[PDB]
Design a binder for this molecule. Structure first.
Ligand SMILES: *C/C=C(C)/C=C/C=C(C)/C=C/C1=C(C)CCCC1(C)C
Length: 137
């Protein structure tokens, strides 16, 4: 549907706790939380093909996928992984990830477009769920 847009963050909950589960030490967690306050998501959607560009003040990364096809990206804490996105309803998709090398927490994310025009992202590591809410620029 209309995931396409330039999204700007308005709320971020449990992000520090997510990073803690992921092994990031406290000073870097605090700096990462501060960096999440500037952060923007740009989405281009055509059918079930998505282009996503995530950017903060000094860093930017692009994610390209088709729903239902495995692709490679990185976990939140930077460990490369294989990902697979599926729809869960009209305007929510869920991505499951598997580490390429090694072991670690089970991670995943979801992206939802609400009826009131917000984008909700969740990122999960084991039992900890980070929720971020965006509005269009
Ligand atoms: C569909 C939207 C997705 C998959 C968004 C992914 C977002 C990230 C991988 C954000 C990561 C960040 C850090 C790892 C620390 C700096 C702040 C963030 C939130 C940009």
């Amino acid at each position: 549907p209309n995931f396409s847009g330039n999204w700007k963050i308005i709320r971020s909950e449990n992000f520090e706790e997510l990073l803690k589960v992921l092994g990031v030490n406290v000073m870097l967690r605090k700096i990462a939380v501060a960096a999440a306050s500037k952060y923007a998501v740009e989405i281009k959607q055509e059918g079930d093909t998505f282009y996503i560009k995530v950017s903060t003040t000094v860093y930017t990364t692009e994610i390209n996928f088709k729903v239902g096809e495995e692709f490679e990206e990185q976990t939140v804490d930077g460990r490369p992984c294989k990902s697979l996105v599926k729809w869960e309803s009209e305007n929510k998709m869920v991505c499951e990830q598997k580490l390429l090398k090694g072991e670690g927490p089970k991670t995943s994310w979801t992206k939802e477009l609400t009826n009131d025009g917000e984008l909700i992202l969740t990122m999960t590591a084991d039992d900890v769920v980070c929720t971020q809410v965006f509005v269009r620029e």
